[PDB]
From a paper:
Responding to this critical need, we introduce here a fully automated method for collecting, selecting, and merging data from hundreds to thousands of in meso-grown microcrystals. This approach boosts the collective phasing signal of many tiny crystals to a level where de novo phasing of highly challenging membrane protein targets becomes not only possible but also fast and high-throughput. We refer to it as the in meso in situ serial crystallography—experimental phasing (IMISX-EP) method. IMISX-EP has three components: (1) in meso crystallization (and in situ soaking where appropriate), (2) fast, automated grid scanning, and serial data collection in situ, and (3) real-time data processing and selection of data sets followed by structure solution.
IMISX-EP using heavy atom co-crystallization was demonstrated with BacA and PgpB. The crystal used for data collection was relatively large and measured 10 × 50 × 150 μm3. As the crystal had its flat face oriented approximately parallel to the windows of the well, it was possible to record 140° of data using a rotation angle of ± 70° from this one crystal without compromising data quality at high-tilt angles. Because of the strong anomalous signal from tungsten and the high diffraction resolution, the structure was solved with the relatively low redundancy of 2.6 and a completeness of 91% with SHELXD/E. This example shows that the IMISX-EP approach can be used with large single crystals. The strength of the phasing signal, as estimated by the Bijvoet ratio, ranges from 1% in the case of native-SAD PepTSt to 7% for tungsten phasing of PgpB.
Author numbering: 1 to 201
The structure:
């Protein structure tokens, strides 16, 4: 359907475009321009923000939220959340090792030990936070009438995580957009599935 196909097509176009010198040059220019806004206090804040996208943070977060939902509503939907997360990490790893993009390496503020495209923190955040939002709104009746705000929070968090990877000099903008599009794709897939299997609307 429209939204996951558009994101998939957007990723393919980006995966091709990063091989053009025009995009590589714009990616370099934006990466270096981000250094100009840096301050040490903001370096610290952005490092804290970026941890919200770390798989070492999101795995215990998903397990905690899923456990909470199990006690509160007896749902096993936390297993769906773990599955889409694992799918997300597997897909990011396979694409990274296939594409083998070199990292910016102008001015990194955090450590990395892998290829650059697509960004795993951005892919993690664009998948997990909208997914969490979906299942929280599904299972927490006190979040009804706050649904738009829950999803806005998930979107703000994911965007900030992506911004932080460019700020911290470890991803190019296109790495972030590539990870955004595929994490969001996985979100729409698991949301569409969960809604499709409902026996009452
Ligand atoms: C959701 C839309 C429908 C489905 C998705 C298909 C269309 C995606 C839209 C724009 C892709 C832009 C990609 C961003 C990278 C820019 C690519 C580019 O402009 O390349 C210029 C070329 O390199 C000069 O030599
Ligand atoms: C127009 C809307 C539909 C778009 C559908 C297709 C658009 C993207 C094309 C192929 C995707 C696969 C990308 C694979 C990467 C190709 C570039 C590449 O591999 O370059 C390597 C070569 O060694 C250079 O040195
Ligand atoms: C009603 C029950 C369902 C809702 C669930 C209620 C709680 C969910 C809300 C906040 C969780 C905050 C948890 C903070 C995340 C901890 C992640 C962690 O442990 O971090 C590991 C560290 O990063 C290693 O590198
Ligand atoms: C549905 C069954 C539940 C989970 C499926 C498998 C759970 C997947 C476990 C998460 C995988 C993971 O966290 O990957 C490591 C991370 O990418 C750092 O390298
Ligand atoms: C109607 C749509 C049909 C789709 C319906 C399901 C919704 C999609 C969600 C998850 C896919 C499940 C695939 C499970 C693959 C798990 C892979 C895994 O856990 O690997 C961990 C990772 O490799 C550590 O590095």
């Amino acid at each position: 359907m429209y939204k996951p196909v558009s994101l998939f097509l957007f990723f393919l176009i980006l995966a091709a475009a990063i091989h053009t010198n025009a995009v590589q040059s714009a990616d370099e220019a934006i990466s270096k321009a981000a250094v100009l806004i840096r301050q040490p206090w903001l370096n610290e804040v952005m490092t804290g923000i970026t941890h919200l996208g770390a798989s070492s943070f999101l795995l215990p977060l998903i397990v905690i939220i899923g456990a909470g939902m199990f006690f509160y509503r007896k749902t096993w939907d936390g297993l769906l959340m773990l599955l889409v997360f694992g799918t997300d990490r597997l897909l990011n790893k396979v694409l990274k090792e296939w594409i083998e993009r070199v990292r910016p390496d102008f001015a990194p503020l955090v450590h990395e030990s892998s290829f650059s495209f697509p960004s795993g923190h951005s892919m993690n955040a664009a998948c997990v936070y909208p997914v969490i939002a979906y299942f929280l709104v599904k299972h927490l009746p006190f979040l009804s009438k706050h649904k738009k705000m829950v999803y806005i929070i998930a979107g703000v968090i994911a965007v900030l995580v992506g911004i932080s990877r460019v700020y911290l000099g470890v991803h190019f903008v296109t790495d972030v957009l590539g990870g955004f599009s595929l994490g969001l794709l996985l979100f729409f897939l698991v949301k569409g599935f969960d809604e499709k299997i409902k026996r009452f609307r």
